[PDB]
Enzyme design. Structure first.
Site, mmCIF file in Angstrom:
data_model
loop_
_atom_site.group_PDB
_atom_site.id
_atom_site.type_symbol
_atom_site.label_atom_id
_atom_site.label_comp_id
_atom_site.label_asym_id
_atom_site.label_seq_id
_atom_site.Cartn_x
_atom_site.Cartn_y
_atom_site.Cartn_z
ATOM 1 N N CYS B 207 -71.776 87.903 57.577
ATOM 2 C CA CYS B 207 -70.898 88.977 57.599
ATOM 3 C C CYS B 207 -70.224 89.171 56.114
ATOM 4 O O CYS B 207 -69.931 88.201 55.669
ATOM 5 C CB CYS B 207 -69.648 88.809 58.406
ATOM 6 S SG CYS B 207 -70.326 88.827 60.044
ATOM 7 N N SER B 485 -58.662 85.685 63.661
ATOM 8 C CA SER B 485 -59.637 86.076 62.804
ATOM 9 C C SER B 485 -58.945 87.132 61.628
ATOM 10 O O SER B 485 -59.492 86.902 60.465
ATOM 11 C CB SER B 485 -60.800 87.006 63.428
ATOM 12 O OG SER B 485 -60.874 86.685 64.748
HETATM 13 S S1 FES Z 1 -70.938 85.138 59.447
HETATM 14 FE FE1 FES Z 1 -72.561 85.256 61.218
HETATM 15 S S2 FES Z 1 -71.356 85.951 62.823
HETATM 16 FE FE2 FES Z 1 -70.149 86.488 60.897
#
Ligand code: FES
Ligand code: FES
Ligand SMILES: [Mg+2]
Ligand SMILES: [Mg+2]
Lengths: 570, 570
Positions: B207, B485
């Protein structure tokens, strides 16, 4: 029992009961964005998602081919109109680690594999599973995960290795294990020894005889959790790839029927698995693995259940280690289905159990070719190799919570001798090397090799081979709280419970104590009085654990006794 | 501390210290026969054996490319004169599971990965390790295994994903997470929402922002356990494959020097990792993972150590979530080495620490291009984004054993409000939907989301987005024993210890209790008297665990508190 482990499907007859949790709600847009990134179209989001769990790795013959098998499973899943998502767990090689402290990591790998597959299936919301194990501990690990999740699943066995052939001699891994002792005894030269090592393992697949892998593959087929022939098709056979490519078709049908592992793994199908172990002479390790599988679906299975099936089922099969032939020869005479068809015809098996074909065992076996006319591998019921099964449960003074032995019937009914006690495999082997004659007539006790004391309940091969190499096979007995890989031609008992680390009587034995093994009474007794034994227990202190960190310390903290299948999640 | 976990090498300057246990003795003929079967020649038996541990699986963008990377690592290991044996563990997708009960399986996957790699390396007697993680929890799991084994190892980060681009707009996974709330608020249409989902994740890689994966990759590079640039080269960049092909050359040199993980991961290099987290604005999750890494090498690392480094290191980087840019933009201005060169020049880093290049950090950074002239991502020390780090440790009445918050400095110094208490994420979200105004001015407590209560310490994104969507971001505070998060523009505290399941004060809060957060005093306090709080504790009973079997029940049995990094093997 009410197992509570993994997520429930969102709240039918849909085929994507679980993956709909993430593919359907607008509130799961992040999930759908990842899925698009991995290649799913909008139409693919409507399909069931199958987790394809292989145990490939490059450093073991039993597992090096499994990535190729996984690609074939994925193609078949896609050909069945579903989405196939491959993932892969670890495994370890019992054949590489045998004889070393790495063997302390082997049994617990079963439970790590189960945790691994449970984790992925749960986090990713997969609707069903196809597992591709290829080695000893992998097989029960995959089934245990399927039992916890209770989502439709099929186990595709990676298949057995073929025997090695060189210059009109045949070899297998056991030839290689035995090579060193034959060289030390002068039975073979160093050059002959080297030739064994170069030709024992000729390609991919699990170890070749009726040892743990082939025992469990056959038992899991008998339990209905693998497709017919999975256990008997060799790893390198083109039909194994064809089975892989068909697993998706069968799994689709299981999703349509919602035929789940707890609908397939039942008291009756557990008994069917146990029947196959007794008839085929399968490994004592199947006691641990079948108990763990039963617990994974919330059922009960005890040592006494194994004794009852052993008493009810004769040993019929002339297969190594006990016999002549190997798994590839079963393949040539009609395979595992032909064997099970015979056992069903004899009335030893429950034919009404559902299986991963979407039909019952009896329906599966109705059409399969029977055992080839004239075959001499499977004895008739009227001329069995042994009237009852090899697997025997022993209790008595020194194993009050149970123990497991492979009894051929050629060892005799009784053994009595003074105890010769070792706190581990290393000291026993050093003693038999320095003074083999001090072992004559004794009951050799190798303790501290249990689930917690080992740690890890290592399997030990060298003690039986050393005893036979010294000419002592029928002249002493061998007892452990761990596990033994082979026979000695005499009395060999493992899984003694409670283990020494837990203060069981095995941990209180002293050199010279007279120990008597009585197979008819099913007892391992001591001449020491119960009062003196209790005196020793009052003075006993548990030794320090051999580890304080890492996976083996977690195992020490979690593992149940061998009589309880060494389950770790209760 | 004296860590005892894995086998010791047989008893030098040989390069095959461990694999010699199985390749050299005649008594390990079985091991050698398997190795011949997997393709090793007699000459190959003389070579070091490298375990190449990838976390490939097909169902996540962060991991789908890792099999290709593993093939490049194997080729490079062979090009360096060694034997490369690939193996592969599981992982899970935080982005797929976020918002669902599958997130209960995410944090513990770090510890399962560590157990997995420890198991294989130990059973197979491999001399060194190259790990290829690509996702959040994978990275610390691989380092923790390396710390337990203390065999030469290198972590090759799989690399960050690139941002998605469509029609002159840029998207990432966070765009996709936010899409639903923007659609419910009427900010975007359903068709615009669908467009976000199709373009947020354009290919392979972790991500995209300074979230947990990029935080940990950068921190592990700063710690010396990855090669320079590993953390900043994108997953799809040709230079990532080149790094893979060079890892074997570097690992060979580490075997020649016997430069091991406990020689590289030291109090000073742990501090270097922590410095990078503070300067870059990295995730609060790094508190858990860096503690776990420190414990894996037998070192100590506490919450107070994090507070001291936060106070000593300004926040300098304009990177999402807090800022504008993403990891690929760091790559274009000189990468992680350029950033660390600047921090070293400022005197914030210890340059004498050894690294996997076989040289010190300062030697590595001597030659790297400095930050590009004119770049506006890394602020000068004299004009930082925040005078000190974002990471703040809070104690006080309600978090006596600690808690972790990301504090930008724009939230203010204090918050006081009546408690609004929920026993989980679901009930909080149902309440903010049915009656958002009842949340105005409150301190929202989401409890029962800790390591044992969750179970699994799930990370929760929806509560902060729901609060912002209701216009309440700076009008309430948010507290949990789990993890959050995102930010809300207000006070958001996680990791509160002891967790509610353990009877910590968070589990005794009642609706209406006045809770005060004081950032300067570093306290989360209650107006309830200590005596009434103790009265409530005397009447408190722990709720039943949410599971009784499987991997999560084992986690409940093994996990330590969040202040202790949620380690499982102590
Ligand atoms: S770093 Fe793999 S799901 Fe976000
Ligand atoms: S090592 Fe795999 S079945 Fe023997
Ligand atoms: Mg076994
Ligand atoms: Mg994390």
């Amino acid at each position: 029992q009410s197992v509570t482990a993994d997520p429930s499907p969102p709240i039918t007859n849909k085929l994507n009961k679980y993956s709909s949790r993430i593919t359907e709600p607008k509130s799961q847009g992040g999930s759908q964005a990842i899925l698009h990134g991995v290649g799913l179209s909008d139409d693919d989001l409507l399909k069931p998602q199958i987790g394809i769990s292989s145990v490939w790795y490059e450093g073991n013959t039993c597992n090096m081919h499994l990535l190729k098998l996984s690609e074939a499973v994925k193609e078949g899943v896609e050909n069945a109109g579903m989405v196939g998502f491959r993932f892969n767990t670890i495994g370890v090689s019992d054949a590489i680690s045998m004889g070393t402290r790495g063997m302390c990591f082997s049994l617990q790998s079963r439970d790590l594999i189960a945790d691994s597959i449970e984790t992925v299936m749960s986090a990713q919301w997969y609707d069903g599973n196809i597992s591709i194990p290829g080695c000893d501990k992998n097989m029960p690990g995959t089934i245990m995960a399927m039992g916890r999740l209770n989502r439709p699943g099929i186990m595709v066995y990676g298949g057995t290795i073929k025997p090695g052939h060189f210059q009109d001699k045949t070899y297998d891994i056991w030839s290689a294990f035995q090579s060193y002792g034959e060289f030390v005894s002068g039975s073979i030269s160093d050059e002959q020894r080297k030739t064994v090592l170069h030709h024992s393992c000729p390609g991919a697949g699990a170890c070749g005889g009726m040892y743990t892998a082939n025992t469990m593959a056959s038992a899991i087929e008998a339990m209905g959790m693998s497709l017919p022939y999975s256990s008997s098709i060799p790893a390198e056979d083109p039909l194994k790839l064809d089975e892989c490519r068909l697993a998706g078709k069968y799994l689709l049908e299981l999703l349509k029927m919602d035929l789940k592992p707890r609908d397939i793994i039942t008291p009756k199908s557990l008994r069917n698995a146990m029947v196959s172990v007794m008839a085929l002479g399968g490994s004592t390790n199947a006691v641990l693995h079948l108990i763990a599988i039963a617990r994974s679906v919330g059922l009960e299975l005890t040592l006494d259940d194994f004794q009852k099936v052993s008493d009810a089922v004769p040993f019929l099969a002339d297969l190594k280690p006990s016999g002549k032939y190997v798994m590839e020869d079963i393949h040539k005479i009609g395979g595992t289905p032909a064997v099970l068809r015979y056992l069903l015809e004899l009335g030893l098996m429950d034919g009404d159990c559902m299986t991963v074909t979407g039909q019952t065992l009896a329906q599966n076996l109705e059409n399969v070719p029977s055992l080839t006319e004239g075959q001499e591998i499977i004895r008739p019921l009227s001329n069995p190799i042994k009237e009852t099964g090899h697997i025997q449960i022993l209790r008595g003074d020194l194993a009050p919570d149970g123990s497991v032995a492979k009894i051929t019937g050629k060892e005799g009914l009784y053994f009595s001798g003074p105890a010769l006690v070792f706190e581990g495999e290393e000291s026993m082997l050093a003693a038999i090397s320095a003074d083999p004659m001090s072992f004559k007539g004794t009951v050799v006790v190798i303790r501290g090799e249990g689930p917690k004391g080992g740690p890890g309940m290592p399997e030990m091969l060298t003690p039986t081979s050393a005893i036979m190499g010294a000419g002592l096979g029928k002249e002493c007995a061998l007892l452990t709280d761990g596990r033994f890989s082979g026979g000695s031609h005499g009395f060999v008992v493992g899984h003694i419970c409670p283990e020494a680390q837990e203060g069981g009587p095995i941990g209180l034995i002293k050199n010279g104590d007279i120990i008597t093994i009585d197979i008819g009474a099913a007892r391992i007794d001591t001449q020491v009085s119960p009062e003196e034994m209790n005196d020793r227990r009052k003075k006993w202190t548990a030794p320090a654990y051999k580890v304080n960190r890492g996976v083996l310390y977690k195992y020490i903290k979690n593992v149940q006794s061998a009589s309880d299948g060494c389950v770790t999640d209760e």
